[PDB]
Amino acid sequence: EVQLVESGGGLVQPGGSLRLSCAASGFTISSSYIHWVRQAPGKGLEWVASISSYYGSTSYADSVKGRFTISADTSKNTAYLQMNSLRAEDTAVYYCARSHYSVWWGWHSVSYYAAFDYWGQGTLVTVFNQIKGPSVFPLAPSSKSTSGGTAALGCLVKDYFPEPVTVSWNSGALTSGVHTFPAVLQSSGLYSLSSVVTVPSSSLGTQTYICNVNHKPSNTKVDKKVEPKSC
């Protein structure tokens, strides 16, 4: 019942402005605080802002003090965060949550305290400029990958920016054995990840395999079929 949903993600220019909205469901934001917690890529959680829509009290961290502003349209049970002057450091995934208010220092609501009990799902605010369409190549099974009753084929996603890249095989039907690797930031400055799927070698010549690389940050939809080198 108590649900929290975040929307407003995307890519904005360095120093640009974005707006994120947390839609609250199953509860009244008047009887709880609203929080915003970001997660930098590969690092821990960091608290950003708090608001007190019943009281209106606010609080921000010195990381985003002044630059970030939290608001609560109490008429629609919705909280917002307006980020201005987005920095390359600010690129993260922004979560929203709730907790009780407990106006007295150290005193907490014995009947209604559950520290950050309900949470959102995560929205990405890419703060970059460089945009690179993804280069896709096949990883052909061959005399090397024929070995046994099990074969190995894959797709290579090279020199793209910025993240993320969503990879699905054969329109998302081939899921067993699929290991989609994390990207590695090459010396060129563009990320690179490779997706591979393990399928029986008996199905190489009869079952066709297609990887669906999707790079929505660049509005690109690549459909590549992996064909055995044969030659």
Partner: peptide, 23 residues
């Protein structure tokens, strides 16, 4: 009912201190 007065408490030490409040 639930709204209004609510019994509060703080555990600054190993001596729970119960209290009631309304704001």
């Amino acid at each position: 009912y639930g709204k209004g007065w609510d019994l509060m408490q703080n555990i600054m030490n190993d001596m729970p201190i119960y209290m009631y409040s309304v704001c």
